Amino acid sequence: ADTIVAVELDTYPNTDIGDPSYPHIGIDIKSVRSKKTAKWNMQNGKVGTAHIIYNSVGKRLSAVVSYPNGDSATVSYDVDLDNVLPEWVRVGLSASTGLYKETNTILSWSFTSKLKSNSTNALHFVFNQFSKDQKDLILQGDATTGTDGNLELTRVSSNGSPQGSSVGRALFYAPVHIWESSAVVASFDATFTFLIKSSDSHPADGIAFFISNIDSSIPSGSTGRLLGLFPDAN
Amino acid sequence: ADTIVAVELDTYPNTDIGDPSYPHIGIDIKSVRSKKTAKWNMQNGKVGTAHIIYNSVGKRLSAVVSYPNGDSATVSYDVDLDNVLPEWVRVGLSASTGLYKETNTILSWSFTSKLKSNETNALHFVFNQFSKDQKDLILQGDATTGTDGNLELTRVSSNGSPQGSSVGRALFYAPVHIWESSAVVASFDATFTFLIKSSDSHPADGIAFFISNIDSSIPSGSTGRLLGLFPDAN
Amino acid sequence: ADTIVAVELDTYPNTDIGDPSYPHIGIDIKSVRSKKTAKWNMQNGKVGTAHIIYNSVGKRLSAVVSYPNGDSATVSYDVDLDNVLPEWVRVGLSASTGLYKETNTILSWSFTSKLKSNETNALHFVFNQFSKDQKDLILQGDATTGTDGNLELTRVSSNGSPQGSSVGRALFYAPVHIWESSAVVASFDATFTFLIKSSDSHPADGIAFFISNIDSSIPSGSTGRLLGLFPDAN
Amino acid sequence: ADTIVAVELDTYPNTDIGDPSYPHIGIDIKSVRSKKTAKWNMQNGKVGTAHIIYNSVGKRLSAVVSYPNGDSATVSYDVDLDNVLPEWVRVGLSASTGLYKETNTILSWSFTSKLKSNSTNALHFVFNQFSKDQKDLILQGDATTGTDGNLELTRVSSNGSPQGSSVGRALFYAPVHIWESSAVVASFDATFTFLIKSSDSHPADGIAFFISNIDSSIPSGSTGRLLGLFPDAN
Numbered sequence: 057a058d059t060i061v062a063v064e065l066d067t068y069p070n071t072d073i074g075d076p077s078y079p080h081i082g083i084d085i086k087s088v089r090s091k092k093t094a095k096w097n098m099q100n101g102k103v104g105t106a107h108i109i110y111n112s113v114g115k116r117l118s119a120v121v122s123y124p125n126g127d128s129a130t131v132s133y134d135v136d137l138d139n140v141l142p143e144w145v146r147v148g149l150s151a152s153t154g155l156y157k158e159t160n161t162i163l164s165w166s167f168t169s170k171l172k173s174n175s176t177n178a179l180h181f182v183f184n185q186f187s188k189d190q191k192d193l194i195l196q197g198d199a200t201t202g203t204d205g206n207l208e209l210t211r212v213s214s215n216g217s218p219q220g221s222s223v224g225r226a227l228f229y230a231p232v233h234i235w236e237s238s239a240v241v242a243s244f245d246a247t248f249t250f251l252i253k254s255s256d257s258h259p260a261d262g263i264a265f266f267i268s269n270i271d272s273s274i275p276s277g278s279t280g281r282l283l284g285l286f287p288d289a290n
Numbered sequence: 291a292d293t294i295v296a297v298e299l300d301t302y303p304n305t306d307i308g309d310p311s312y313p314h315i316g317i318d319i320k321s322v323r324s325k326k327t328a329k330w331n332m333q334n335g336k337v338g339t340a341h342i343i344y345n346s347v348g349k350r351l352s353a354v355v356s357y358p359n360g361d362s363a364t365v366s367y368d369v370d371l372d373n374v375l376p377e378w379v380r381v382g383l384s385a386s387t388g389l390y391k392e393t394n395t396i397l398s399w400s401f402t403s404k405l406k407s408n409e410t411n412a413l414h415f416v417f418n419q420f421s422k423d424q425k426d427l428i429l430q431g432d433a434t435t436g437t438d439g440n441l442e443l444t445r446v447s448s449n450g451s452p453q454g455s456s457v458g459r460a461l462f463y464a465p466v467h468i469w470e471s472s473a474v475v476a477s478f479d480a481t482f483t484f485l486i487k488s489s490d491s492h493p494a495d496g497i498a499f500f501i502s503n504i505d506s507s508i509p510s511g512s513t514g515r516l517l518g519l520f521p522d523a524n
Numbered sequence: 525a526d527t528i529v530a531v532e533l534d535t536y537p538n539t540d541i542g543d544p545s546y547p548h549i550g551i552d553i554k555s556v557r558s559k560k561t562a563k564w565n566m567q568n569g570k571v572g573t574a575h576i577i578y579n580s581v582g583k584r585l586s587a588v589v590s591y592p593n594g595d596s597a598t599v600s601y602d603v604d605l606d607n608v609l610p611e612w613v614r615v616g617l618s619a620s621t622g623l624y625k626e627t628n629t630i631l632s633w634s635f636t637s638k639l640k641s642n643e644t645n646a647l648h649f650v651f652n653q654f655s656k657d658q659k660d661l662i663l664q665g666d667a668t669t670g671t672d673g674n675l676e677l678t679r680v681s682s683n684g685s686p687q688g689s690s691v692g693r694a695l696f697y698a699p700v701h702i703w704e705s706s707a708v709v710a711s712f713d714a715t716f717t718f719l720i721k722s723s724d725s726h727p728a729d730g731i732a733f734f735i736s737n738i739d740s741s742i743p744s745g746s747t748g749r750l751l752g753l754f755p756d757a758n
Numbered sequence: 759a760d761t762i763v764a765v766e767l768d769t770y771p772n773t774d775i776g777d778p779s780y781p782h783i784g785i786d787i788k789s790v791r792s793k794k795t796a797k798w799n800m801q802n803g804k805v806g807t808a809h810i811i812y813n814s815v816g817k818r819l820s821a822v823v824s825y826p827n828g829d830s831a832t833v834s835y836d837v838d839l840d841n842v843l844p845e846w847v848r849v850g851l852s853a854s855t856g857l858y859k860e861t862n863t864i865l866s867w868s869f870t871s872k873l874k875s876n877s878t879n880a881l882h883f884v885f886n887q888f889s890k891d892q893k894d895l896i897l898q899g900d901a902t903t904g905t906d907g908n909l910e911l912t913r914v915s916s917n918g919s920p921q922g923s924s925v926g927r928a929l930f931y932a933p934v935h936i937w938e939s940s941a942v943v944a945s946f947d948a949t950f951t952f953l954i955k956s957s958d959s960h961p962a963d964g965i966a967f968f969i970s971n972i973d974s975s976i977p978s979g980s981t982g983r984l985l986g987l988f989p990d991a992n
């Protein structure tokens with residue numbers, strides 16, 4: 057299967073599969089069943105910001121999600137990504153809807169990865185605007201870009217209305233050398249701003265930043281609770 | 291054919307096709323026949339640094355090549371890249387040998403592109419070492435990656451000996467959005483360090499940083515004076 | 525006197541001292557009488573962006589001023605700043621009013637300087653929010669920081685009204701090493717966003733990004749057309 | 759007393775004040791007695807690199823010291839620096855010798871701090887070469903810069919021999935806004951490369967990256983095991 061590291065903003069509690077019984081942020085290591093979660097109040101129709109930091113030296117993947125009012129949720133998990141991820145990866149953003157839905161709108165996305173010995177390899181990109189033809193993104197499933205300048209990870213019905221059983225992802229075009237055996241520091245950070253909007257009984261399913269094998273594809277049947285990330289709930 | 295913008299470090303005077311009659315640096319705009327050149331003393335077997343700066347506001351593409359002893363060559367050309375390049379490009383390094391040869395070894399290469407506004411998209415990468423399997427580079431022709439942690443643009447022997455009739459290029463994997471009609475600033479810079487070494491009667495043929503259409507390939511017969519860049523000498 | 529290189533956003537035509545007869549951006553080198561100007565449509569009450577670029581290869585001091593409707597004015601002047609500026613400087617923002625007035629509100633300011641090779645010294649600061657007690661800015665004359673996250677270079681009344689005969693500057697706290705003899709490029713850039721509002725159909729006097737000796741202070745009487753920069757209009 | 763957060767590269771075990779009985783990197787929070795240490799193989803006369811990372815999400819102050827053969831030592835300590843540091847600080851490098859001595863030579867220092875909320879205030883500096891009159895560094899005690907491009911924190915004799923009972927520090931000229939209550943992520947990193955050379959039975963006393971109140975000065979008698987940081991060994 058693919059190998060997945062993800063920070064999910066999980067708007068829908070699937071308690072059947074380990075979710076806590078609230079919207080949450082969580083850190084996913086090779087499983088949709090988060091290794092750590094924090095209660096998250098998603099603010100409907102508001103623009104949130106997710107910051108994801110992996111500290112290669114502290115061996116700690118950390119995330120915060122916040123909204124302009126001050127409200128933030130924070131999660132940290134101690135992990136050495138050297139033992140999890142392959143050396144080369146693609147990075148991206150994933151969202152899904154299932155029986156319930158929400159807009160999974162990305163308004164900006166940056167990423168910085170650095171491999172240090174004494175000499176550094178580094179990759180930084182920032183999207184503050186997405187083109188209708190955003191050639192440096194691989195769009196997968198239902199994901200689209202433009203002309204409002206946003207990345208729509210799942211189907212949105214152009215009057216702005218979220219569609220259910222949708223799954224979409226965007227990966228940065230270039231593979232990322234995310235760790236190296238000889239790298240003293242293999243750190244990365246990612247930032248994205250998003251607009252989740254739902255009028256549903258409950259919003260579902262969430263957005264994730266993720267790191268995958270290079271050839272990673274949306275697994276068959278990963279709408280809903282699987283966030284476009286996983287083939288199953290294991 | 292391809293659309294090419296390049297800064298050449300041309301180790302070989304092809305005075306039959308417009309070269310000045312000395313090793314030179316030059317700024318190539320859709321032709322191997324540089325728009326501006328400066329005399330350049332290539333220092334055999336020394337590590338040189340090339341800095342390329344495109345100032346989108348100043349509409350000036352500038353280049354310096356220097357060596358540790360301070361000796362530098364500078365060229366600037368006034369040009370609006372909006373009128374030359376397609377919106378989406380690949381950026382890369384090119385080198386060739388012909389009837390004469392030299393090593394065209396790249397030891398480092400960084401690039402930063404930024405589009406403002408009204409906000410900023412950016413791409414920055416830096417390579418200080420090149421891996422055997424450098425997945426974020428499209429290698430073309432004879433170009434191979436390290437060790438000695440180096441990018442060899444043209445054929446060299448494992449024991450350091452350059453080959454004639456060689457052409458190779460390395461392009462960053464991701465397409466770059468190099469300008470956009472609504473960009474207030476569409477600037478970029480590139481830097482690379484290189485080791486050109488020859489025991490030939492004359493070193494040839496040079497190294498270029500270039501920017502091409504996304505699908506750019508080595509044009510047939512662009513070994514030698516063309517310097518993996520152009521289909522002919524027009 | 526101080527030594528001043530400035531990029532002026534001059535709102536008030538002082539035709540008796542060589543201003544053209546329209547609001548303009550200009551490049552000032554040791555004189556308030558710009559070496560080069562471009563006509564500028566100041567958009568009253570709109571948030572403008574100024575971007576300022578110089579490197580020691582092209583030696584072209586460029587500035588663009590743009591508003592989010594996409595109107596922009598650009599000005600460039602080739603000038604060798606090695607020959608103009610002290611090696612070490614402070615960098616700053618300055619603004620002034622005289623008989624006529626405007627708010628000279630800075631909403632953000634960023635600056636980068638670099639000296640490469642053989643390696644890099646760099647200074648980069650970004651202020652997107654100014655703090656009430658901004659310990660890394662030297663505020664001079666009427667300049668004040670909020671709350672409201674803004675820098676008001678010149679005095680604004682309680683009722684929102686800009687006051688005349690005001691001058692103020694903010695300089696970054698650290699000296700900046702603007703050129704170094706062994707450097708093979710020296711580059712700087714600066715960007716700032718600003719909000720000039722006038723209810724006089726006579727906004728005055730304007731805002732400058734400036735570079736000066738480290739001990740630079742507001743020349744006496746440099747309110748109004750002298751922009752907080754010059755002791756006289758020579 | 760100053761408030762000190764520091765990462766120490768402690769060459770000399772002062773077991774009577776809680777050092778482990780080996781050279782060590784440690785995390786110091788308001789005491790010379792490190793909250794956490796790791797055993798460190800100081801490679802006499804090799805250029806080492808220290809990397810220090812903290813962010814306010816993960817709140818893990820991590821540091822690694824490595825040498826080009828790939829030997830590294832890492833230490834991390836979870837600590838909420840909001841509760842330790844003043845909001846504004848100066849950042850610096852400190853070193854000392856006592857009865858025993860070592861060159862405490864700094865070959866490079868880079869620092870970045872950022873305060874993000876909605877998408878950022880930032881300070882970044884890098885010194886790869888120290889200038890004889892480095893106007894953006896505040897040198898304290900025995901510390902001296904240039905003409906060799908290095909910063910010698912402690913006294914080195916004309917014949918190359920390091921002197922005992924020496925303390926010197928370099929702080930960056932500007933105050934750094936290390937935390938802000940409205941920031942959702944405050945982060946800093948620091949990298950420095952160093953060359954510790956002893957010809958004796960033993961090297962002492964070590965080098966620290968430190969963060970302090972803006973008016974921080976060398977405490978009296980803080981040569982030796984106090985590393986220029988602390989007034990006592992409490």
Ligand SMILES: CO[C@@H]1O[C@H](CO)[C@@H](O[C@H]2O[C@H](CO)[C@@H](O)[C@H](O)[C@@H]2O)[C@H](O)[C@@H]1O
Pocket residue numbers: 068070153154155156157260261279280281282
């Ligand atoms: C076992 O019963 C299930 O009930 C839920 C909804 O109540 C439904 O889950 C689907 O929709 C949610 C919300 O989008 C997703 O999280 C799930 O993955 C799934 O698609 C089941 O289908 C059943 O009715």
Ligand SMILES: CO[C@@H]1O[C@H](CO)[C@@H](O[C@H]2O[C@H](CO)[C@@H](O)[C@H](O)[C@@H]2O)[C@H](O)[C@@H]1O
Pocket residue numbers: 302304387388389390391494495513514515516
């Ligand atoms: C007609 O004579 C030409 O002679 C030159 C060199 O003697 C040769 O040029 C080749 O080699 C150079 C140097 O490497 C390249 O720049 C050229 O493109 C070419 O490959 C010509 O082929 C002719 O013989």
Ligand SMILES: CO[C@@H]1O[C@H](CO)[C@@H](O[C@H]2O[C@H](CO)[C@@H](O)[C@H](O)[C@@H]2O)[C@H](O)[C@@H]1O
Pocket residue numbers: 536538621622623624625728729747748749750
């Ligand atoms: C000529 O006498 C004055 O009238 C002028 C206006 O022409 C005024 O100049 C002041 O105001 C302008 C606009 O703000 C500035 O550019 C000048 O420097 C100055 O402050 C004089 O002060 C007198 O009123």
Ligand SMILES: CO[C@@H]1O[C@H](CO)[C@@H](O[C@H]2O[C@H](CO)[C@@H](O)[C@H](O)[C@@H]2O)[C@H](O)[C@@H]1O
Pocket residue numbers: 770772855856857858859962963981982983984
């Ligand atoms: C016990 O008397 C002293 O001997 C110690 C060392 O054992 C010496 O300490 C000095 O040197 C060490 C090593 O440099 C430092 O860590 C100390 O702080 C101090 O400078 C004393 O000075 C006496 O010689």
Ligand SMILES: [Ca+2]
Pocket residue numbers: 066067068069070075261262281
């Ligand atoms: Ca869920």
Ligand SMILES: [Ca+2]
Pocket residue numbers: 300301302303304309495515
């Ligand atoms: Ca040639």
Ligand SMILES: [Ca+2]
Pocket residue numbers: 534535536537538543729749
């Ligand atoms: Ca004027």
Ligand SMILES: [Ca+2]
Pocket residue numbers: 768769770771772777963983
């Ligand atoms: Ca000690």
Ligand SMILES: [Mn+2]
Pocket residue numbers: 064066075076080082088090
């Ligand atoms: Mn979950």
Ligand SMILES: [Mn+2]
Pocket residue numbers: 298300309310314316322324
């Ligand atoms: Mn040529």
Ligand SMILES: [Mn+2]
Pocket residue numbers: 532534543544548550556558
């Ligand atoms: Mn003017």
Ligand SMILES: [Mn+2]
Pocket residue numbers: 766768777778782784790792
């Ligand atoms: Mn210790």
